[PDB]
Amino acid sequence: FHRVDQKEITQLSHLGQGTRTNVYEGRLLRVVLKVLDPSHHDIALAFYETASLMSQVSHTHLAFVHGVCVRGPENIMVTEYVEHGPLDVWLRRERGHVPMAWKMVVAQQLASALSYLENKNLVHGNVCGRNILLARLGLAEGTSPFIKLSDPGVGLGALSREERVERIPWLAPECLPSTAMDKWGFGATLLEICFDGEAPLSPSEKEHFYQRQHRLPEPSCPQLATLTSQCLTYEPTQRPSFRTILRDL
Template sequence: MLDIMVEEFIEHGPLDVCLRKDKHLITTGWKFTVARQLASALSYLEDKNLVHGNVCANNILLARKGLEDGSSPFIKLSDPGVTFTVLSREERVDRIPWISPECVRNVSTLSTAADKWSFGTTLLEICFNGEVPLKERTPPEKERFYEKELGLPEPSCKELADLIRQCHNYNPSGRPSFRTILRDLTQLQPQGTLWESKPVLL
């Protein structure tokens, strides 16, 4: 018997590619819309006590770009792929700064708190047009970054920087719920921009 997995084709591909390729067309409102949709999808998973485990801009797919006048982006959160619980320590270190510090040390600590850390890093990717934080660092440098409990570069918006800092709390229990994150992003959403309220999980 042959098992076949069928996945939906998403025309516009992963978010990180779009952020880099179309950065001259992307507005602040567009970025907030995408971030809010992602927080909504992860809030749904958190309510079900489900962990995604690999939140990053490369795993967010654009079903609609929303770069034309009168339209808005629409995302789908992709399958996480191979869970990092089966990866070696070296492979987990390579996933810094998306993987949470506690999960580098011990994969059995995987929880929704890990998704909050990953969301904070993904939010930075969105802010910085798909640029990957720490991409120039070697694996030992990445490990030391976590060991010293350092912070990643921050966006110029103070409120957004504060939210990312909360997601990147080195104490997992100190990270905000996705409902709180969603509320904060809604309050920060620039007025007059279009957004979809129900993102889809792929």
């Protein structure tokens, strides 16, 4: 990844929080600055691995990483500013007013981005609505939405059990104690999209759900029902490839 100097970045309004990060609007060009918390070197390394991965990839439905600013105890990931922000926040504002054809486009754009990663044997590890950003809302007639999948943030391997339980239902069950984990994440993300930004699923309740090997609900739309059932299986090897998912969509 590219190194950014603090002289090149301006930090503005706080947009939200990520895992171990505070997300701010900023300037470099309008950017999004992901400020890592004062961390251990493992978390800093996991954050760098994410800047590296996202700097070596290029896809229309993958948000851009400008680089990393590393000065003293601060680690700032300089990323692409996407107009309408997180998908879940949007779907929740527009509940009951989001057409099924709109949801279908977002699914296909998300699956093409994920098929690209799959072909390069690269893992995202954090596919959820929050990490799906809306470039274009596709609200006017003859316009489609345009999504860009965000960086996965601090890589999953560096996270505590407590933080992995918080990622349920998007976290693949095998990760509670592979490019197959993005198939679960994708499946749980179709459900969230279908339930208008509302996720299917307290910490103990969520852990017990996975431990008891219970399955997530069926989507509100029947079109995605077979797909979600195939994606949200506890056997990682049985999940379809995004090549198949993209064809089937």
